[PDB]
């Protein structure tokens, strides 16, 4: 299991207030210094914002106006919350921890999250079809939005070696599709996080 | 303008030693400067903090060093999962003075690799939906240039397939590409052979991969 698990909504529309949690596994909040950083697709990494071991709550000069930073110990979770969001707020969201309990420093964050997916845009979301690739075997899965990408595993983790999933692409109708491939001498997991849809398909000849 | 990284994107071969330098405006607090390693879709990863101390289970051919407002992440012996987008950042003592810098990209060359070609034709399920995705596969080639032509009876096919890339491989600095093709099932079934071309430097000639629609 990973440490930090980011939490949200996957795709929303603009003017809404979006809504992140940083959920911690295994250890208490109380303490505990966090670290919310941002990078919108092939940009750079921006700071947002932070909770130091002492609780106290530093806010880049941007997001000073625009975000609440907050702690709920009881449920073990971070949150971050993002008013009147915009085009410029869509990127991968990541929470990271500073081991030294600094709520505003970037040069040790030795823990991260895997980051959850933001893209803001006025269209609904839609799930996925996921179709086989029969004999290398794979699955397409395509016509799914917004943006943010499904995620595809095989054998429900077991299948690791000679997996290549690509990057998605953003087809004429502007829906998206993407492909996973394995080469072999079979159930590929989709999850689309925004649609909160989840399909096992299985490939065969 | 607060932290610059240089150069913005370099290249090298595999045992290769290549540095890249950060320059922030202030001078850095108590030593605080960080390196960051960032792999195609993964979150960044804290290789050096403190200037020059490695992150354990960091491979030691990893090393960081500067002073002030110059410091520099050299990689002795450059390695395909090396693969990356490296940034600094840097802690100027106190609230709001940090930022990241800028990043930078490294690539990996390595010797000619031709691809492995595979066709999978449109299944049952999605030709009940009125569409047809035929779609070819090049496999664990190099460099990335490669051209991908889609062939129906033999007649040429433009504007009707999309394509995408994999980033070099972490063990192999190969690439991976995918070809999909796309028309509605009225188009697909008036027509028999489907066939993906592929040109690649490591191919003597183009490998074409069909299959009979039945």
């Known amino acids: 299991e990973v440490q930090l698990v980011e939490s949200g909504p996957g795709c929303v529309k603009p003017s809404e207030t979006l809504s992140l949690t940083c959920t911690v596994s295994?250890?208490?909040?109380?303490?505990?210094?966090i670290t919310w950083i941002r990078q919108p697709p092939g940009k750079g990494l921006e700071w947002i914002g932070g909770?130091?071991?002492?609780?106290?709550?530093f806010y880049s000069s941007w997001a000073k106006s625009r975000v609440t930073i907050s702690v709920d110990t009881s449920k073990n979770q971070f949150s971050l919350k993002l008013s009147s969001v915009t085009a410029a707020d869509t990127a991968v969201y990541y929470c990271?921890?500073?081991?030294?309990?600094?709520?505003?420093?970037?040069?040790?964050?030795?823990?991260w999250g895997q980051g959850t997916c933001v893209t803001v845009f006025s269209a609904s979301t839609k799930g996925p079809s996921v179709f086989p690739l029969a004999p290398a075997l794979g699955c397409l899965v395509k016509d799914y939005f917004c943006e943010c990408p499904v995620t595809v595993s095989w054998n429900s983790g077991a299948l690791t070696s000679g997996v290549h999933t690509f990057p998605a692409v953003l087809q004429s109708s502007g829906l998206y599709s993407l492909s996973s491939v394995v080469t072999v001498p079979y159930i590929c997991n989709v999850n689309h996080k925004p649609s909160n849809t989840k399909v096992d398909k299985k490939v065969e000849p | 303008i607060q932290m610059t990284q240089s150069p913005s994107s370099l290249s090298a071969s595999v045992g290769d030693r290549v540095t890249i330098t950060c320059q922030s405006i202030?001078?850095?607090?108590?030593?605080?400067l960080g390196w960051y390693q960032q792999k195609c879709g993964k979150a960044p990863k804290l290789l050096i903090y403190?200037?020059?101390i490695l992150t354990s289970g960091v491979p030691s051919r990893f090393s960081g060093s500067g002073s002030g407002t110059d410091f520099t992440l050299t990689i002795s012996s450059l390695q395909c999962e090396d693969f990356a987008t490296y940034y600094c950042?840097?802690?100027?003592?106190?609230?709001?003075?940090?930022?990241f810098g800028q990043g930078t990209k490294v690539e990996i060359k390595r010797t000619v690799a031709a691809p492995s070609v595979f066709i999978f034709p449109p299944s049952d399920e999605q030709l009940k939906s009125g569409t047809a995705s035929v779609v070819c596969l090049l496999n664990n080639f190099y460099p990335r240039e490669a051209k991908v032509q889609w062939k129906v009876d033999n007649a040429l096919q433009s504007g009707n397939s999309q394509e995408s890339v994999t980033c070099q491989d972490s063990k192999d600095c190969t690439y991976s590409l995918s070809s999909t093709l796309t028309l509605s099932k009225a188009d697909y079934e008036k027509h028999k052979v489907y066939a993906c071309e592929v040109t690649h430097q490591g191919l003597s000639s183009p490998v074409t991969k069909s299959f009979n629609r039945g």
């Open positions: 990271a921890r500073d081991p030294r309990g600094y709520g505003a420093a970037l040069d040790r964050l030795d823990l």
């Open positions: 295994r250890f208490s909040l109380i303490g505990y210094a």
């Open positions: 909770i130091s071991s002492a609780a106290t709550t």
């Open positions: 202030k001078s850095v607090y108590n030593n605080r």
């Open positions: 403190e200037t020059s």
């Open positions: 950042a840097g802690g100027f003592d106190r609230s709001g003075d940090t930022t």
